[PDB]
Design a protein around this ligand. Structure first.
Ligand SMILES: O=S(=O)(c1ccccc1)N(CC(F)(F)F)c1ccc(C(O)(C(F)(F)F)C(F)(F)F)cc1
Ligand SMILES: COC(C)(C)CCC[C@H](C)C/C=C/C(C)=C/C(=O)O
Lengths: 214, 9, 219, 10
């Protein structure tokens, strides 16, 4: 039904002049937007909800999905994060660009804790499936279908944490206590992309642009 | 919309 | 699970279940009603926190920091109990949408508040799962400005594992009630945000009123 | 910082 290996597979398949940090970030978000859809498509079952649902969930869930993915990929960067493009952003620039406070928030609540615990790649893939399967999304034909699928991940993942890590008692809850901060953090990051789009002075690209015009 | 759709197809 | 866990839950239910009662268009005043009310909660919430094993311990700017931004989450959680599915309403007198909409709130902040209350009502949680869940909600490491982040994520964990145990014992055939519940905290981050945007909306009205409210909602 | 400190120390 929701097997954890078919999730990590996806986690894996998607596996990879001047630098302004916001120009670099936006380019990076766009790049990834494309491969988001390709990661989505390999989530057991995602393929199969109605179009209009598949499109509400990628719209509602994309920013929190890119973030988790980059914090996770940023584990051995220091005071920083590693763009899909290879370029980096570090606190100094984050702070310059006015994004100081959630940038550190991203560092402290995600990159770091994703270090301290050594969250492995299945665990990430599953955290991202749980994220993608978002039953509060305004517009869904069948919110309980979405939620049943979600709950398929919860049981797959708990089960899995009892396999790979039987000595860590609550690791499954440690895993999910990341998603509430992921959510506040992701709401704030968006208000910044919104304000960067409106000033116009930051170069947005085709795909991310569509994501940002409701 | 437009772009997402056709990738989802 | 452990009798220790079990006595801690019992002390919590009691803790809640007693806090839970010290008891209380020119018609703007409808609004200033809602105002009177939210104070009563804010009162109860600090009242509850203080009683939590560990809370007076922390630097009181921490226990400020935690109280300050847990408040709606907790107040939303209780609004979620105290909700009547046939009435589509919330309680001897009760509260419609048009009521919410009758004070100045008149946007959809309202629809979120009510959509959440029908979801949490359906869970059909009890006095233990609710308090348990409020206590997790209060010990959120990640609130704005907070010295002892490890202390908080740490007293969190006690409640988290107590609930995981409690659920395992009592929802033998529905063990996804745990990540199901736990996850409302996430939805609780969105509601709270929608509440600031609500607070923001009428502060260009102006209204602010209550010292206490502007104190938590940093106006 | 304030009416809270009064609800707290109490
Ligand atoms: O006052 S509530 O009705 C309430 C009743 C009982 C216990 C706690 C709270 N309430 C509903 C909520 F879902 F949020 F819990 C509520 C809370 C906060 C507000 C407001 O902060 C204020 F001003 F009304 F107090 C505001 F409407 F401004 F946003 C309004 C209603
Ligand atoms: C400082 O944070 C901003 C708001 C500039 C970035 C917000 C995060 C969104 C998801 C933009 C994406 C950055 C990406 C997608 C990096 C990556 O994976 O390459």
């Amino acid at each position: 039904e929701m097997p954890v290996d078919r999730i990590l597979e996806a986690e894996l398949a998607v596996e990879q002049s001047p630098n302004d940090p916001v120009t670099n970030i936006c380019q990076a978000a766009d790049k990834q937007l494309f491969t988001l859809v390709e990661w989505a498509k390999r989530i057991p079952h995602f393929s199969s909800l109605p179009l209009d649902d598949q499109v509400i969930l990628l719209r509602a869930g994309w920013n929190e999905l890119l973030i988790a993915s980059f914090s996770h990929r940023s584990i051995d960067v220091r005071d920083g994060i590693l763009l899909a493009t290879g370029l980096h952003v570090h606190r100094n620039s984050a702070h310059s660009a006015g994004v100081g406070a959630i940038f550190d928030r991203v560092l402290t609540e995600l990159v770091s804790k994703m270090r301290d615990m050594r969250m492995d790649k299945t665990e990430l893939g599953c955290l991202r499936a749980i994220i993608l399967f978002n039953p509060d999304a305004k517009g869904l034909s069948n919110p309980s279908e979405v939620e049943v699928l979600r709950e398929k991940v919860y049981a797959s993942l708990e089960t899995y944490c009892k396999q790979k890590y039987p000595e860590q008692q609550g690791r499954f809850a440690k895993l999910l206590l990341r998603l509430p901060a992921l959510r506040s953090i992701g709401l704030k990051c968006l208000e910044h992309l919104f304000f960067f789009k409106l000033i116009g002075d930051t170069p947005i690209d085709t795909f991310l642009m569509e994501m940002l015009e409701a | 919309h437009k772009i997402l759709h056709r990738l989802l197809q | 699970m452990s009798p220790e866990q079990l006595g801690m839950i019992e002390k919590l239910v009691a803790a809640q279940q007693q806090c839970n009662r010290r008891s209380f268009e020119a018609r703007q005043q409808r609004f200033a009603h809602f105002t009177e009310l939210a104070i009563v909660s804010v009162q109860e919430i600090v009242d509850f926190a203080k009683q939590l094993p560990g809370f007076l311990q922390l630097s009181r700017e921490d226990q400020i920091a935690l109280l300050k931004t847990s408040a709606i989450e907790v107040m939303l959680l209780e609004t979620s109990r105290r909700y009547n599915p046939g009435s589509e309403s919330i309680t001897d007198f009760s509260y419609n949408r048009e009521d919410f909409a009758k004070a100045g709130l008149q946007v959809e902040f309202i629809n979120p508040i009510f959509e959440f209350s029908r979801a949490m009502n359906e869970l059909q949680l009890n006095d233990a799962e609710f308090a348990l869940l409020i206590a997790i909600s209060i010990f959120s490491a990640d609130r704005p400005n907070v010295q002892d982040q490890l202390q908080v994520e740490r007293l969190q964990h006690t409640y988290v594992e107590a609930l995981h145990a409690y659920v395992s014992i009592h929802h033998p055939h529905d063990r996804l009630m745990f990540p199901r519940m736990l996850m409302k905290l996430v939805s609780l981050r969105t509601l709270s945000s929608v509440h600031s945007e609500q607070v923001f909306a009428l502060r260009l009205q102006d209204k602010k009123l209550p010292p206490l409210l502007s104190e938590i909602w940093d106006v």
